[PDB]
Amino acid sequence: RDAFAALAAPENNSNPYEYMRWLREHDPVHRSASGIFLLSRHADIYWALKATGDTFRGPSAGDLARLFPRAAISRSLNLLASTLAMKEPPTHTRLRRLISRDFTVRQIDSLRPSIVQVTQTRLGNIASSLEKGHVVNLHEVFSVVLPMLIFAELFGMTQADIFELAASIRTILEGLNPHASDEQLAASDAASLEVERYFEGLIEKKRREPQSDLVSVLVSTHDDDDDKLSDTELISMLWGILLGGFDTTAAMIDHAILDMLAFPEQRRWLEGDAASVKAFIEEVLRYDAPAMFSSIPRIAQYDITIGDVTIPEGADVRVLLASGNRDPAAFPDPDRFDPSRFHGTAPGMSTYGHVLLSFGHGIHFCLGAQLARVQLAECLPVINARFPHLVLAGDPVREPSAFLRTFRSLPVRLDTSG
Ligand code: HEM
C-alpha cells in the first residue's frame, strides 16, 4: 500500500487522520513505491525539518529531472528550480536574507486595513443574496479572492494582473504534473514566458516611479547594505512568493470557516482581543493543515537510520505535516478542536511547548506565515460579525490536490427561522 496513493484515495479523502494514525504507529518511516520516504510522526518530522541543511540537502538538477521527467529542460521547471523553496544554503541563505530585509512584519501589518476593506466589499457583494435565503459558494466568491487581492496590494499590481497571473500559475502547475500532456507542457512554457515578461515590466516600472509597495522597496537602494536581489533573482522571488500563497491561503480560510460552522461554541474566540483571535487561527492550522505534505524535496546526504529503517544516500524524504499536528505525543486529545492550546503563547507554539507543523520548521519555514495569519486574523472576525447566523448549506466539495486539502465549493446560507 503506497501511502501517497492511500492518502489520495476516495476512502481517505474526506478524513485521512485515521490512516495517518495507522502510519504513525505501524509504518512511521514509510517507503513509498517510488522509493520516496514519508515521515508521519511529529518527532521525526520535527527532526527532519530542523536538520535540513546538515543531514539533508536540497534537490539537485538530477533530482528535479527525476521528479519532473516530462519537464526536465522546460522553462517552467527552470523557474521553479530558481525559487527559494528549491534552493539550499548558502545560496538559500542570501536570498532569504534579502527578501526578509524588506518583506517585514511592519510591511505585513500595514496590509491589515486592506484586508478588512476587501472583506467588507466582498461580503457586501453577497449580503443581499444571503439575506434573500439563497446559498453562496463562499470559497469561490471570497476564499480564493482575498489572498490574491492582498498580493496585488502587496506587490503594487492591478486586480486584473493578479487574476491573470493566478491563471498562469494554474497553467504552469498543470504543466508540471507527471501525467501532463505535451499540450499542457507547451501551454506551461508560454505562461512562464508570460510571467517573466510581466515581472520584468513590473520591476522596470517601480524602478523609475517607486511607490510604497514591496516591489518598489525591493528594487530601490538600501542604506545599510549594497547587496540586493538582481532582476533575475527578483523575478524568481516574486514568482515563488505567489506560488507559496496560491491555494494554501484560500484553503486555510475555507478550513477556518468550516471550523467556525462545525464548532459554533468556539466562535467566541473570534470576538475577543487580538490574542484570542490568534488562538483560534493557530488551532485551525493544527486541526487541518491546509498543506498536508511538504513539496520541498529533502535529499539524504548519507545513509540515514530512523530506528532500524535505513534511508540511503540520495533518497527523497517528505513529511506528513498534518499527521504530526495530530500526534498525541505533541498534542494531547489531538482530535479535539481547542483554541486554548495556543492562547497567549508565541505563534505556532502550544502551552506545553510543542510546535504545530503547518508552516514547516527550520530554514525553509514558510516565508508567508505571518502574512497568512494576519489575513485570517482580520477577515474572520469580520465574517463572524457580519453574518452571525451563517450556517453550512451543504457538504463542501473537495478539490483533488496532490498535497493540499483544498475545496471547490464551501456552500453557506443564513439560518431561516422566523
Ligand atoms: C495557509 C497558508 C500557507 C501555508 C499552510 C504554507 C505552508 C508552507 C510550508 C509548510 C512551507 C515549508 C515546506 C517545507 O519546508 O517542506 C512553506 C514555504 C514557503 N512559503 Fe508558505 N504557506 C502558506 C502561505 C504562504 C504565503 C501567503 C506566502 C507568501 C510569501 C508563502 C511563501 C512561502 C515561501 C517563499 C516558502 C519557501 C521558504 C523557503 O524555502 O525558505 N506561503 N509554506
Short mmCIF file of C-alpha atoms and ligand atoms in Angstrom, two decimals, residues 49 52 83-87 92 96 99 103 147 151 154-155 237 240-253 285 289-291 293-298 318-319 321 357-373 375-376 404, ligand 1:
data_model
loop_
_atom_site.label_atom_id
_atom_site.label_comp_id
_atom_site.label_asym_id
_atom_site.label_seq_id
_atom_site.Cartn_x
_atom_site.Cartn_y
_atom_site.Cartn_z
CA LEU A 49 12.79 19.81 9.17
CA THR A 52 17.53 20.43 6.53
CA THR A 83 12.67 29.62 -6.22
CA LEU A 84 13.79 29.91 -2.60
CA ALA A 85 11.91 26.71 -1.74
CA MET A 86 14.09 24.71 -4.16
CA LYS A 87 17.40 26.26 -3.04
CA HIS A 92 19.26 29.96 0.03
CA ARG A 96 16.16 34.55 2.28
CA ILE A 99 13.70 39.22 0.89
CA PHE A 103 9.26 41.67 3.49
CA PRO A 147 -5.38 36.24 -0.88
CA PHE A 151 -0.96 40.03 -3.12
CA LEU A 154 1.47 43.91 -1.57
CA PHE A 155 3.24 43.93 -4.93
CA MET A 237 11.39 35.68 -5.57
CA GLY A 240 7.84 31.91 -5.61
CA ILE A 241 6.04 34.22 -3.17
CA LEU A 242 2.90 33.95 -5.30
CA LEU A 243 3.29 30.19 -5.67
CA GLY A 244 3.67 29.82 -1.91
CA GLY A 245 0.42 31.72 -1.37
CA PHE A 246 -1.52 30.04 -4.21
CA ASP A 247 -4.32 27.74 -2.94
CA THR A 248 -2.73 27.39 0.52
CA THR A 249 -4.15 30.63 1.95
CA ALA A 250 -7.58 30.05 0.40
CA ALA A 251 -7.61 26.54 1.90
CA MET A 252 -6.73 27.95 5.32
CA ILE A 253 -9.66 30.37 5.03
CA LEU A 285 -3.81 25.40 11.32
CA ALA A 289 -3.03 21.55 7.81
CA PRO A 290 -4.02 23.38 4.60
CA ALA A 291 -0.84 21.77 3.25
CA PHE A 293 2.70 17.38 2.89
CA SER A 294 5.98 19.05 2.16
CA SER A 295 6.60 19.65 -1.53
CA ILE A 296 10.25 20.64 -0.96
CA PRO A 297 12.43 17.57 -1.65
CA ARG A 298 14.84 16.72 1.18
CA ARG A 318 8.84 14.00 2.66
CA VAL A 319 6.92 14.85 5.83
CA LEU A 321 2.79 17.80 8.42
CA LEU A 357 3.97 21.96 11.75
CA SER A 358 1.54 23.54 9.26
CA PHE A 359 4.20 26.10 8.27
CA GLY A 360 7.27 23.86 8.46
CA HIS A 361 10.29 24.43 10.66
CA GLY A 362 13.91 25.44 10.23
CA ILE A 363 15.42 27.24 7.26
CA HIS A 364 12.50 26.69 4.84
CA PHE A 365 9.88 27.79 7.38
CA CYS A 366 7.05 29.44 5.45
CA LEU A 367 8.12 32.91 4.37
CA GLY A 368 4.45 33.94 4.34
CA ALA A 369 3.43 32.52 7.72
CA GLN A 370 2.77 35.97 9.20
CA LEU A 371 1.02 37.14 6.03
CA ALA A 372 -1.37 34.18 6.13
CA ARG A 373 -2.00 34.55 9.86
CA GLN A 375 -5.16 37.73 6.67
CA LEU A 376 -7.24 35.31 8.73
CA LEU A 404 -3.32 20.26 -0.30
C1 HEM B 1 -2.13 28.89 4.84
C2 HEM B 1 -1.18 29.36 4.04
C3 HEM B 1 0.21 28.69 3.91
C4 HEM B 1 0.66 27.52 4.37
C5 HEM B 1 -0.13 26.47 5.19
C6 HEM B 1 2.05 27.39 3.96
C7 HEM B 1 2.90 26.34 4.22
C8 HEM B 1 4.25 26.30 3.93
C9 HEM B 1 5.19 25.27 4.33
C10 HEM B 1 4.82 24.03 5.16
C11 HEM B 1 6.40 25.59 3.85
C12 HEM B 1 7.71 24.79 4.03
C13 HEM B 1 7.54 23.39 3.45
C14 HEM B 1 8.80 22.58 3.65
O1 HEM B 1 9.70 23.01 4.41
O2 HEM B 1 8.89 21.49 3.04
C15 HEM B 1 6.28 26.85 3.13
C16 HEM B 1 7.30 27.52 2.48
C17 HEM B 1 7.20 28.74 1.84
N1 HEM B 1 6.08 29.54 1.79
FE1 HEM B 1 4.25 29.06 2.58
N2 HEM B 1 2.40 28.52 3.25
C18 HEM B 1 1.29 29.34 3.20
C19 HEM B 1 1.18 30.57 2.60
C20 HEM B 1 2.22 31.29 2.05
C21 HEM B 1 2.18 32.68 1.69
C22 HEM B 1 0.97 33.63 1.88
C23 HEM B 1 3.37 33.02 1.20
C24 HEM B 1 3.75 34.43 0.70
C25 HEM B 1 5.02 34.86 0.78
C26 HEM B 1 4.21 31.83 1.22
C27 HEM B 1 5.52 31.72 0.78
C28 HEM B 1 6.38 30.67 1.06
C29 HEM B 1 7.76 30.57 0.63
C30 HEM B 1 8.51 31.61 -0.22
C31 HEM B 1 8.25 29.42 1.10
C32 HEM B 1 9.69 28.89 0.89
C33 HEM B 1 10.54 29.36 2.07
C34 HEM B 1 11.94 28.79 2.00
O3 HEM B 1 12.13 27.74 1.33
O4 HEM B 1 12.86 29.36 2.62
N3 HEM B 1 3.47 30.79 1.74
N4 HEM B 1 4.96 27.24 3.20
#
